[PDB]
A paper describes a structure:
The phage tail is a macromolecular machine responsible for specifically recognizing host bacteria, penetrating the cell membrane, and forming a channel for genome delivery. The conserved structural components include three main parts: a baseplate, a long inner tail tube, and a tail sheath that wraps around the tube. Phage P1, a temperate phage first discovered in 1951, transfers DNA into a wide range of gram-negative bacterial species by universal transduction and has been used to construct a fine structural genetic map of E. coli. During the tail-contraction, the tail sheath undergoes a massive conformational change and contracts to half and more of its original length, exposing the inner tail tube and providing the energy to drive the tail tube to eventually penetrate the target cell membrane.
To improve the reconstruction resolution, we then re-boxed sub-particles and resolved the partial structure of the P1 extended tail, including a tail terminator ring, eight sixfold sheath rings, and eight sixfold tube rings at 3.3 Å resolution, which allowed us to build the atomic models for the tail terminator protein gp24, the tail tube protein BplB, and the tail sheath protein gp22. The 53-layer tail sheath and tube of phage P1 are terminated by a hexameric terminator that covers the distal inner tail tube and embraces the top ring of the sheath. The terminator consists of six copies of protein gp24, and each gp24 consists of four domains: a central core domain (residues 23–127, 151–244), a β-hairpin domain (residues 128–150), an N-terminal domain (residues 2–22), and a C-terminal domain (residues 245–260). The inserted β-hairpin domain extends into the distal ring of the tail tube and lies in a groove formed by two adjacent tail tube subunits, and these interactions result in the tail tube protein in the top layer having a different conformation than that in the other layers. The N-terminal and C-terminal domains of each gp24 together form a two-antiparallel-stranded β-sheet that is inserted into the top ring of the sheath to form an augmenting β-sheet. The 169-residue tail tube protein BplB consists of a β-sandwich domain flanked by an α-helix and an extended N-terminal domain (residues 1–31) arranged in an α-helix and two loops. The β-hairpin plug of one ring is precisely inserted into the N-terminal outer rim of the adjacent ring exactly, and relies on the electrostatic interactions between the plug and rim to form a stable 53-ring tail tube. First, the N-terminal α-helix transforms into a β-strand that interacts with the β-hairpin domain of the terminator protein gp24 by β-sheet augmentation.
Numbering used by the authors:
A (entry chain a), C (entry chain f), D (entry chain e): 2 to 168
B (entry chain v): 3 to 528
E (entry chain d): 114 to 168
F (entry chain k), H (entry chain l): 58 to 113
G (entry chain w): 425 to 528
């Protein structure tokens, strides 16, 4: 039917070895947050993010219809969505109440801690996969309670706005 | 840019002919919904044989229309042109006795001899003559001259000798055109450059539509052919075509009768002979087909009514035959010369337009008359006998159809009546048409059923009839009875009755659709 | 039932042969990106695109309501969505950090490398199926981390804006 | 329970025969595009459309609240979405590159070619089901390439703008 | 035209369930053709605008 | 089969396009010399299409 | 005058002949060898490919000749003589054009 | 396999990329010394990849 078909498995073996040459793929379940002076909440986090890390773009239409996009100033501030689990002693509620009561800025460190790169009972982090945010504000959201959800646990949603990204 | 040639040869180029001050361009299209038939007199054509003509062949087949100044010879081609705008048909040509076709005989040396023979006769070769070439097409070469040219060609691979035979056409002015070319060999076993046979009679029969040849078997072997210039056929003529005896017309009608092409209408194309019209009506009634005929248009209103009775159609035998009368005048299409001819092929156009509406069974219930289906498209209409008024009630009693002016302004056929004197709901055109269509469908069904293992059976004949009658009800041809109390709601009743065991009987009844032709309004005042 | 039905399998056979006359159909999993001087990242790409190939259109209403659409200037700049996989050594994060730190323009080449057209362990590209983008800017996006995603590997999304398309 | 129920299967049989009286139903897989002088691309088309065939409407409010909609000028230009399959020799890509490189207007003919109405190996078309579009411009969209789509074939999307509809 | 209210092979309508529209304009829409839809038949979409409703 | 619904609830099934491609299952027996294994290895290594004739 | 002074007509037949020669050379390695049945399937495939490419077209007159661009048949006289023949209807070229202006 | 639909309703199946990874079932028996249990415990405790040779 098709006269162009021809098999070549040496090439496929080459691609397989080239892909496997690099080490591993980071599983998305391996991370850690610090929250500066409140290090007891690091266990309860369940979802995190990495900031956008983009720039503004400037559009200029040249002679005729020629258009060029150019780099702009760095984007500093943004938002990050974080979800936490809630205990029966109100750790997250007390944390949010304290944050609202006194205007504070908290530094947050985002790191990746794979099982392969660890010594003893302590995780070890790498400079390449570590990012930092400074002067962050922690805000809460509406928390849903309902019956007939016997199989679910309450999970507050937190909204964090950073003001500088450093690495 | 560079030079531009006037005529094409063998080189690769683009040529433009000189500007022509007068000429006409005509398009064409093919369709085979319904097939008509008829007889007539024309310029050229093989006489007394069935000829199939379409919109693109009615000029090559048949011929150039005859001039109206000749008289009474121009009507059939106009009728054919009017009728052919819908669908194709079949035509049989009638020719007078004093008609001859040309022929050229060739001596052993190669010199030609000219003569002519009547159409019925057969060619007999005199001793001392090798072969003869004549014209198969019934075309006299009087006004367009046809010339024959012979020249030698390369011998065959096996050693046989062959020559080129060319045919040319020259007009009266002097313009010369090329018609056909062939490679022909006198030897029995010879082959063409393409591998085909080159024997003269076989090649002429196979790949030539103009010429035929007859050879003398005894003297063909020692025959020689030399190059000759143009040789023109002479002696071929057509007798006075305005005077045609009834015998030729009856022969043409008999030729139509024995034709297997299964047409769906019969037309009288300008034939005003009573015997021929009655024969055509017999053909029409034989095949369960519609038929359209025409009385002489020059007759006045008073004389038209007896002329209908002159033909034998008026009676109970010939149902679904219509007779028209059109005493008006119009400008001819080909030459603006104010000719007069009747309405045959205009009614058939209306019937074909009605038939084309439905695709399953055809929808034969539509009447030919009306302002939408039937329109007369002619240049300028002028009454021949103004300040005269026909007697419409007498025409209705006489089964003669009338023509009236429509709302738009063009001429319209305003009635459709068949030649049946009895009051049977049968003088309406569509009522016989439905039953004829159903009968034809039944005949086709019964012919196929005969090849079944059991054969014709009463149980088998009911299922098919129910299917076809249901289809006809779906098309809208059959409607429920007007009074539901007296008669049942069903449109058709199919029943089988048995008396003894030898005799069976299958009958079906139908309630045809009605037409709307008489309307009355009654104004009031509050 | 239907009186128009008629079977004709010679026509279908002709259609089948006509369709099979052409060689093959390109599989969407066979491509390659180069990224100019950084050729060590070509392995980690997982999704790419082809530029738009369009023109601006000019609308004019003639007499009465007659309307005509006319060709306009070519469209130079656009966006392309590219997804890459992430390793435990942060190749993609380091690449994006370096690109943000120094304003740079990188030339990106997109090519199709089917298995049938290949010699030895090296793929060969065709001029008809090869496209190039010049003066591109590489920007990142939000990277999603979460637990309970033990079966998934983290895949950052990249946004690339090109400024000229050449072939 | 219901006193108006009554059975009548002669009426249903009549409806069935009336519906089956017409010939056939056109299957949506039977069509053909021509593309004027490029008749080698007709095989690779996979989706097409028929133009809108509409008119503009003029609204007038009469005495009291009476409203009338009136016919307006014909709508000439529009858009048609056409999908094609891609071979390993870049036929569609080369076609699009050539069309973009030189401003051209191409005439496109769309017709339906059912198997029932065909003679020999050649399809025959009908004037009733044939439509034509003149002075068309052919433009492309973004083409998506991705791995883990081993069961799919690349299919470019084409956008065609016509300027006149003739039949 | 329900099956229950019918006589013979002809349907019969009722004034209560019958409505009429006058001075309508019939407009077409885009018609989709595609392969791999071997089990489907082409179905044009029509858009009709009426100017008076009478009963 | 193309499926259509007419007026009221009547329904018609119509002939459609022919089915060309499909699947078929074959069971065979293996010898010492690895005939079938080598055959399948060769088929996987190089893309090709063969023609099968079935006779009753 | 064999329709052969046109350039493409001999070229098509030469290409078909070369394809047939290559097909028949391979078939000699078949366990059966060269057979009449074997020579029909491959030639039908090849001629269908040429028909698809546009080289062969249907005859101009459908009434006189069939609608098939090519006719392949096998003839048998006694047992020792077999014969395989195929006929083709090549595409025509446009080289001579004429225009005839008129005046209304 | 890659499925395509040509003009009208014709359909073609095309060779695709090779299937690399898959699943296989193995059944074994256990001895008193805990050979298989210790083997599985060692495999779970330390991530590693091994090579298996299957011969008929």
């Amino acid at each position: 039917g098709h006269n162009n078909t021809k098999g070549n498995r040496k090439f496929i073996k080459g691609r397989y070895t080239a892909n496997a040459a690099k080490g591993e793929r980071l599983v998305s379940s391996e991370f850690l947050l610090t929250f500066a002076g409140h290090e007891d909440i690091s266990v309860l986090v369940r979802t995190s993010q990495i900031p956008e890390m983009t720039r503004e773009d400037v559009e200029d239409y040249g002679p005729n219809g020629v258009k060029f996009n150019q780099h702009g100033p760095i984007r500093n501030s943004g938002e990050i969505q974080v979800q936490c689990v809630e205990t029966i002693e109100g750790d997250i509620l007390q944390f949010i109440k304290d944050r609202i009561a006194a205007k504070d800025y908290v530094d947050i460190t985002m790191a990746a801690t794979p099982e392969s790169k660890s010594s003893g009972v302590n995780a070890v982090t790498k400079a390449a996969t570590t990012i930092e945010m400074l002067d962050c504000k922690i805000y809460s959201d509406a928390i849903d309670f309902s019956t007939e959800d016997v199989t679910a646990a309450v999970r507050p949603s937190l909204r964090i706005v950073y003001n500088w990204i450093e690495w | 840019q560079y030079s531009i040639q006037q005529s094409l040869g063998n080189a690769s180029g683009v040529a433009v002919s000189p500007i022509n001050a007068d000429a006409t361009l005509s398009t064409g299209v093919a369709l085979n919904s319904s097939l008509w038939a008829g007889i007539g007199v024309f310029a050229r054509g093989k006489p007394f044989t069935v000829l199939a003509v379409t919109e693109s062949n009615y000029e090559d087949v048949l011929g150039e229309p005859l001039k109206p100044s000749s008289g009474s010879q121009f009507e059939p081609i106009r009728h054919v042109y009017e009728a052919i705008q819908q669908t194709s048909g079949y035509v049989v040509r009638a020719v007078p006795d004093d008609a001859k076709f040309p022929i050229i005989m060739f001596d052993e040396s190669g010199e030609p001899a000219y003569s002519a023979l009547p159409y019925g006769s057969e060619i007999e070769l005199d001793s001392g003559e090798a072969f003869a070439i004549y014209v198969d097409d019934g075309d006299p070469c009087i006004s367009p001259t046809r010339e024959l040219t012979i020249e030698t060609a390369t011998a065959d691979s096996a050693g046989n000798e062959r020559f080129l035979l060319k045919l040319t056409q020259t007009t009266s002015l002097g313009v010369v055109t090329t018609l056909e070319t062939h490679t022909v060999s006198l030897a029995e076993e010879a082959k063409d450059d393409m591998g085909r046979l080159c024997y003269l009679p076989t090649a002429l029969e196979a790949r030539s539509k103009y010429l035929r040849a007859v050879v003398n078997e005894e003297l063909i072997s020692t025959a020689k052919v030399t190059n000759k210039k143009s040789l023109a056929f002479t002696g071929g003529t057509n007798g006075d075509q305005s005077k045609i005896s009834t015998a030729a017309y009856l022969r043409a009608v008999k030729v139509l009768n024995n034709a297997p092409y299964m047409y769906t209408a019969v037309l009288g194309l300008g034939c005003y002979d009573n015997a021929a019209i009655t024969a055509l009506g017999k053909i029409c009634a034989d095949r369960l087909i519609d038929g359209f005929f025409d009385v002489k248009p020059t007759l006045t209103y008073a004389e038209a009514l007896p002329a209908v009775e002159d033909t034998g159609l008026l009676g109970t035998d010939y149902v679904s035959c219509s007779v028209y009368h059109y005493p008006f005048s119009c400008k001819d299409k080909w030459t603006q010369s104010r000719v007069v001819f009747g309405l045959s092929g205009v009614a058939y156009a209306a019937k074909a337009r009605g038939v084309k509406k439905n695709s399953d069974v055809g929808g034969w219930h539509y009447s030919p008359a009306g302002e939408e289906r039937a329109v007369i498209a002619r240049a300028s209409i002028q009454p021949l006998y103004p300040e005269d008024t026909p007697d419409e009630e007498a025409m209705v009693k006489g089964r003669l159809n009338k023509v009236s002016v429509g709302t738009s302004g063009q001429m319209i056929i305003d009635d459709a009546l068949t030649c049946c004197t009895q009051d049977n709901y049968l003088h309406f055109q569509h009522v016989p048409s439905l039953m004829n269509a159903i009968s034809r469908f039944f005949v086709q069904l019964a012919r196929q059923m005969k090849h079944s293992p059991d054969g014709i059976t009463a149980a088998g004949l009911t299922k098919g009839m129910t299917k076809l009658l249901d289809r006809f009800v779906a098309s809208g041809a059959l409607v429920a009875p007007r009074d539901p109390d007296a008669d049942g709601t069903e449109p058709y009743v199919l029943k089988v009755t048995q008396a003894e065991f030898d005799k069976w009987e299958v009958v079906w009844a139908c309630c045809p659709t009605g037409v709307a032709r008489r309307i009355q309004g009654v104004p009031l005042l509050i």
